[model samples]
Target: DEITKKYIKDNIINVDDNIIKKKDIFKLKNENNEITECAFEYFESKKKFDDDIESRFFIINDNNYNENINLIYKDIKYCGLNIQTTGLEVFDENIRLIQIAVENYPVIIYDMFNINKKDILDGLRKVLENKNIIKIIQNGKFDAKFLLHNNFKIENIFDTYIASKLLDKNKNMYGFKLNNIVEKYLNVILDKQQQNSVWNNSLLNNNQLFYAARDSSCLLKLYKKLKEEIKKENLHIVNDIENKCILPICDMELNGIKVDLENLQKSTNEILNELNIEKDNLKIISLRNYRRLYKLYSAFYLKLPLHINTKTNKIHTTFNQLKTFSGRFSSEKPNLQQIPRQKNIREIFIPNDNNIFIIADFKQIELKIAAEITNDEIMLKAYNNNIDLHTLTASIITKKNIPDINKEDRHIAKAINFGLIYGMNYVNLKNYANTYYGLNMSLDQCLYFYNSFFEHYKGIYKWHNQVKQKRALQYSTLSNRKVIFPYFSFTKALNYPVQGTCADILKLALVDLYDNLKDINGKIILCVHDEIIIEVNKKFQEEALKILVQSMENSASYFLKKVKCEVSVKIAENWGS
Candidate 1:
């Protein structure tokens, strides 16, 4: 041990084999009491590394940061340091960078949310004020809580990715993601190339460390370039938009709906058994072949059998993260994209033993939201009057009697609603109508449907067209947040403003819900889409649902009038209920 320490100190950056005698090195023992030279080599190697990288103002594994090590990092208190940040407290406090070494890279660390307290950040801030310290970060919000949690003053923040998008449009065109930025500016190719790495892995090897260091250092150079570009463009508005987007707000009502664990367990067990049978049925394969099997296993979890989205043995649960065109909700797993073709599987979720989940949905929330956004009088009145939008559209288009506007009309209405919201292209629309309906309708028939829907809601159609036009002139961002379009030509422009706004509303609402609900007697266990699941004592179920729904609706409707949406209330006797 003494020889190892001496050798490590002597060779801080690079260790040699002669540091320890071969016999002494071989004497290292692992937990199993087995001699392991390789295990001990790491201890010596890391000691050298930690000392070399630590107590220094530089981080240069491959010469990227070698130039300005002293010029930039020397003054900062914590330069080229790596420590784990995790948990909820990280986001709430304010902090300043005495020196920032990449705030939080997007490595999937376990408990990535944890951050040191406000006092720690405050201390960092005090150090920063005495000397000029530059904090380099790419899209720093992942670490937003670090400064906030530590209560540090964050005046000298340098966000490189934000700067890149505004200035580098001509060079990179699409602007810079982390990898692109590094390669273009730093001449350093960071290989986040390993796609299968788990987020929670703690024992990152040398390659991982190199990946981590490049992110911070590359950011520093990017900030240098972008700050100059910001000066050239005189884009104060960009900064304003960034700040405006960061504001946290929420709806009036918030509730964490109870999950029926027994039903979930039953469903999971069924799936597990089916998976086991499938796994056994497969022929023996090499270790490399397991990767393909792994993907299938993951697909089962994420893309569950169609039944789980709507119903489970414990209780029928609707996942809200799946977006619907109507600004209402969507469900996944079994895919509630369209109602299930087979009603029996859908029935699996209905009132399991007198436990009822009253899913009182707002008929067409997107139509209402669209009406509100565009000030469309006809749409607004139709919504306010609780008009059956589909039947009305069908009556106008078909030139036939409404025919009670039953199943067929409803199906048409559903397709129309989604088509408008998603800006579903002509080809896709025709395919959907053809395959589902067996109508083999011509393009003209599809056009008639589109025209009919747009005619009734003309403003909604115009809104989509204008947004797409603006987006195609180069899809621009009003804020730093990225809005990805599925196709370069496809415009969900009409959808973006409402959806992005809704996303903001939800995030703000979540913060509010998290703050208020945490103090209450219930615990928020999960959030699937728009709906939140809470596990609470049976006695408190009634009150919890009331508070949650009211809070959620209130938060959204606070700025607008009567933001109509349905809140499904379910009170199960047990976790399964």
Candidate 2:
């Protein structure tokens, strides 16, 4: 009371509240009968707010405030909520302030740090947890984790960040941040200097208050604008997927994969030791030298830091929610997605005690998608018959029975199969053959193998012609997600639908898995391209594994009903196995 009284006495005078904020100074009579003008900062600290202020807003605290309670329960259809927290590390931080913005209503700022108003915040939890009211927010994934940890489960959300990403699909990653969106859509330049300022201060500064208000308020505006852009781009389905998956992704980030620190240290040390030996024996500019250097630097220098968390012993990677243009998820701050494929590097990603890591990966997913899209009977039959795709290709190229193909022959066949999708011509395929399998091929041999591949998979040849005609076409996936191919290339156009469909299926599987396992001990730890690594108690591993396989197959069926896709499910004490 004394602080408020002192603040009010020092700041305000007998003028209307509406014009007070605009004035730098104003004239007023003091209790001592002295008339003087005051600066705007004086009145900003006013003890008792003016009538206009009281009528318009609710400044919630521990004491006598029931006005916002009525407003929340007034059955409003939508409300905008934005929270200001300490920083990106929400685990040990607190919500500095929470702004609730309602259309045609005065925005409410809950001074969370003031008086420790648990009763008021606890009361607002009803509004937050209410499923009927749609909550408009920006980057709710980051906020949802903090709120969920604090006992608020955000049920229904219209994330502006997700919507912005849906519309500005080609924009850079920072393009989706709240300030950038507000400026682009609302033409409002929000001052973000206070963003990283002290949020839990005893007295909330005017700049911080304004920043918070602008953020929550602009979300409603951005939501309205982005919705039109979403429909314009036919991105409603993508937006829906993004919004639904945000919370699940948040849960995945929070429940980070546990790393075996001892193994990580051991693996890193061994890599460094081997790299040192290579360095000692190096001859300049050789292919082996280059490969050794690249592997050594990438493993020891680039990745070692990511596997060790500074705050906690647990290694956590930040999932780049809107990073990939193709709808695939990416990670950073120790890019878990790009973790080295070496056995030792992978073995470090082990499960906790009493738990097992179940790696469920879609096998030949893009190939299956290609076959489904092309409606290739031969390809479909091969997949349905459970024929090994690489083996089949090897047989076709080698002019030998599948049983007669050796490991090296299969290796060359594997290169040709993927090279086809990637637009690798016969020349490059020949180079790849020589490099990978030590097979030197003549131009005619390369051409024969390439043409033979098309002959074997006639559906793929047709797919090529069809994709070329639909050049620069807007392709839609089974998830109803679409991507635009502005400039057409034969290989890119063909690869887009196939790869994009694969990305869509992976996301669908993620959402399905989250829904199925939200109540179980199993938690999805990592999603790398077409694979999902889940950690579950050994007892639930079988049930969780079944759910994972079923989710993946079911999601794939949306794109290809006749195609029988395979998911390789393996369980081990560690990830790489």
Candidate 3:
């Protein structure tokens, strides 16, 4: 009472009746589990710790490790989690510091490098293994890598980064990271100047500690805000799909694909020989020369990272959620996704001995999604009746019977069908056919197809206008995933739902497939666009293939209303072969 009275007298501050009342018992209790008469006394005793680090940030050590774990295991239901690492991921890295904070409790900074107590570490292992505690994170892919290397399991994880992105899919906005998210939502400016400081230093600086404190401390507040927004938009199912995918994505990264070094070198030489021959017939800017040069570049440069890891004999590529706004997965440090299938580049990826790669691809997935979203009668009819959509389009455009349509006609229709979904202009459609399929489509021919397409499928045309005119503030997929309207760009507006749904379905399939393959010696080695590749033992290959196909098709069916989704399976000794 004297401390409060003296401060009030000096400051001459007005006091409300609630100012002196104890709102909660948590604030009154200190580290010794003693309650003081006033909270000021409790706070005054905490200043003694300011001699080492900031009082707000507590380093987990011998005296308080059990208390910290007890709070996490018993008291704390949800908290923010962040980690600082010492090296780049996929090459080598060690988690130096772990930052976590719940409301009311001081932000706990676990010094991973110096904490030597096995019991304390084991307690934390159980805490992480517990499925009840929700660990809120932002862009935790790097955290996942470190945790995987350290063998720490992260259960019941929630990524506010993904949740915020799902709330509104505007790539131009800077609301995805914690730094910006804190200021935008919580009204706190987080200084990230010390974000890159040496985390493994013997004596940590105070500034680094402050940064780590705020990095995690703001998440609990930020997550509450994002949760309200997600609920406001009714995107719970979408967020759930992404959350369940966390473990599967981490598993795929760690279960990196084995490489056939001999076959890789052989294919690299073959590509080089072709490149030299093409160079001998070079031009100033020949299209053929450009193609040959790109193949040569991918072969020479991109193939360097395909060598097996020295210890595991498998190359691990990092899968990232940081790259695209489309919810698609991108692999780096050897992007296995974009490898040139035509150049035999994919044959370098092989499974372990007595294991086979079961590559299951969704056949025409985007087109099917487009049909489901737009409610196109022709498209729906084609899919429901087991008719070839490309052939149907060709028949409509050429006024020919479906059986009588030529291969060239069907190919043109294939180009147009995809072009319509992507909102490609007639000129681009012409270019797309010639570039991709090596079939020349004149401007008039493309124009004719475009006009006929909208006329036949009026529903797609209606959807195009709705997007072009900004009919709603956001557009949603069948899975309840929403994308903010593309202001003026109809192409993106047209593109988001189809691509985003496909990505969501792929993630959903991964979660189920990972669980389904748990009983067998099957591991998901790779997930490229619209497809999944798994490494399964030969003895269980048949069952693995069946489970993979069923999981993918089931995911597709769960999200779509009418259009049929097809899965094609291929067994290979190598990824492409």
Winning model by lDDT:
3
Candidate-wise lDDT, in order: 0.43, 0.71, 0.73
What's model 2's lDDT at 203? 60
Rank the candidate models, highest lDDT first.
3, 2, 1
- Candidate closer to the true structure by lDDT (higher is better), 2 or 3: 3
Off by over 4 Å in 1: 1-369, 372-374, 391-395, 398-407, 420-431, 437-448, 464-473, 476-488, 491-502, 521-523, 536-543, 554-577
lDDT of model 3 at residue 118?
Answer: 73
- Give the Å shift of residue 504 in candidate 2: 1.4
- Estimate, for each residue in 1-577, the C-alpha lDDT of model 3 and write its tens digit: 5532532321211122212211223434343666433221111121232222223555665443535334433446787888888867645767878877767665667777667777766756765777888888887666776786787877777898888777656545665667777667776667668876776555555446656776887788788988888888888888878877888888888888887778766766666776777777773456767686665568544556445587776877778753566778888877765566653766767888888889999888888888888898988998899888898899889999976889988888888888776778789888888898787778898899889988998889888887777555566666777666555567776787888888888988998898899899589988888778998899997999899998998898889878778899998887766
Count of clashes in candidate 1: 46
TM-scores vs. true structure, each candidate: 0.48, 0.83, 0.81
Clashing pairs for predicted structure model 3, backbone only: none
Model 1 lDDT at residue 146: 52
Q: The CA-based lDDT of model 1 is what? A: 0.43
Compare the candidates by TM-score and give the number of the best one.
2
Better of 1 and 3 by lDDT: 3
Give residue 268's lDDT in candidate 2 (0 to 100).
63
